Amino acid sequence: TNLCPFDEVFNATRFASVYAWNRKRISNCVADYSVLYNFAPFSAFKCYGVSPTKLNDLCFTNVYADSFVIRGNEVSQIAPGQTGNIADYNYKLPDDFTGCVIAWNSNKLDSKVGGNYNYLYRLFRKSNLKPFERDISTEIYQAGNKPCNGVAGFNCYFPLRSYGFRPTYGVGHQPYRVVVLSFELLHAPATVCGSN
C-alpha cells in the first residue's frame, strides 16, 4: 500500500467553511504520523481514546479527516461535550469521540487585506446538530410567527455569516485551520496502519 495522503488534508490550499466542513476517508495506506506532528506549530492537539505519540504503532479500519476554519476563540468548542455557536450549529463531536483534534493559526494564509469573506459559519438554527451532522442549507431563518417566504427582512434572517478575516485582527479572531481525525475500528481488517 501507499502512504496515507495526510499532506492533501493538512497542506491543502483552501480549507472548507465550518458549516460545510469537508471529510476525507483515509484507507489502505501506511501513515507516518511523524510528518503530522511537525507540519506546523499546533495551537491545539488533543487525542481521545488514543495516545498521540503511539499513532505510528496502531492500525485502524478507517481514518476520517474532517477539516475547516474557525476563529481562534472557537477552537475550544471542537471537543466532546462542548456547546457554543460552532458546536451547536456548525460542527459537533460525539461524547464517545475516538480520535484527535489538531488546530493551528492560519492568519498568513486565510486572512486578507479588506477581509476574506470566503469562510462562512451558521449563526441561526432551530436546533443543535447531531454528532457529525452537516447542514449546508441556506433557508431564511424564521424568528417570528410570520412565515418568511424566502425573503430576508424583519424576523427573517439569512442563516450564514462570513468571518471576514483580516490580518489586523486579534489572535482570538484570527482564522485557525482545524483537522479532526476519527480512528475507526470495525469488525473488519485494519488497512490504515502507522509506519511502525
Binding site: 476563529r71 457554543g84 455557536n85 451547536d88 450549529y89 477581509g115 449563526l123 441561526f124 424568528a143 417570528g144 424583519f154 424576523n155 434572517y157 455569516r161 468571518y163 471576514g164 483580516r166 485582527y169 486579534g170 479572531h173
Partner: protein, 39 residues
C-alpha cells in the same frame, strides 16, 4: 419586544461589518447566539 431588539442587534452587526468594523461585528454575532439561546 424581544423580536425588535434582535432585529436591531442583527442590524448593528451588519452595519459594523459594512463600515469596516469586522472584529466588532464578530463580537455582536456572538451576542446574537447567546441571546437566542436564552429562555
Amino acid at each position: 419586544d424581544k423580536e425588535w431588539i434582535l432585529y436591531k442587534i442583527y442590524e448593528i452587526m451588519v452595519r459594523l461589518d459594512e463600515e469596516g468594523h469586522g472584529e466588532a461585528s464578530l463580537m455582536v454575532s456572538d451576542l446574537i447566539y447567546e441571546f437566542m439561546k436564552r429562555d
